[PDB]
Amino acid sequence: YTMSLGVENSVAYSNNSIAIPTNFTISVTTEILPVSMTKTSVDCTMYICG
Amino acid sequence: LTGTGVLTESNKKFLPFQQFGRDIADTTDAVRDPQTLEILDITPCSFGGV
Numbered sequence: 001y002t003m004s005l006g007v008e009n010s011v012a013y014s015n016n017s018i019a020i021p022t023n024f025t026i027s028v029t030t031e032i033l034p035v036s037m038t039k040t041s042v043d044c045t046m047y048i049c050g
Numbered sequence: 051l052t053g054t055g056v057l058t059e060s061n062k063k064f065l066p067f068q069q070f071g072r073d074i075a076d077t078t079d080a081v082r083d084p085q086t087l088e089i090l091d092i093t094p095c096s097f098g099g100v
């Protein structure tokens with residue numbers, strides 16, 4: 001299929017009118033970041049020559 | 051077949067025709083001994099940085 005970009009909404013704009021939030025949620029959301037590779041070392045001499 | 055290693059005891063299920071066994075690195079990891087048909091484990095001999 002041709003993929004959906006999302007819900008094809010349109011904002012109900014006007015002059016002289018505004019929308020104001022009456023109620024709210026706290027949200028908690030994960031975010032994950034890597035920080036380290038596995039510290040690795042090669043004895044190039046033993047690796048090449050056994 | 052030459053090498054240097056720790057010749058440990060093995061439980062490895064050698065099939066009747068098999069002469070030796072390898073790990074992924076082409077490293078021969080087990081041998082049927084040619085004088086007595088017991089199976090040796092060629093465990094890695096230790097090395098590290100100074």
Ligand SMILES: *[C@@H]1O[C@H](CO)[C@@H](O)[C@H](O)[C@H]1NC(C)=O
Pocket residue numbers: 014015016
């Ligand atoms: C603002 O919207 C009203 C209708 O609500 C319209 O009559 C008026 O012309 C608009 N004025 C401007 C400056 O857009």
Ligand SMILES: *[C@@H]1O[C@H](CO)[C@@H](O)[C@H](O)[C@H]1NC(C)=O
Pocket residue numbers: 022023024
């Ligand atoms: C906000 O939403 C919660 C949902 O449980 C509701 O109980 C509460 O009455 C609402 N508060 C306001 C100020 O609208």
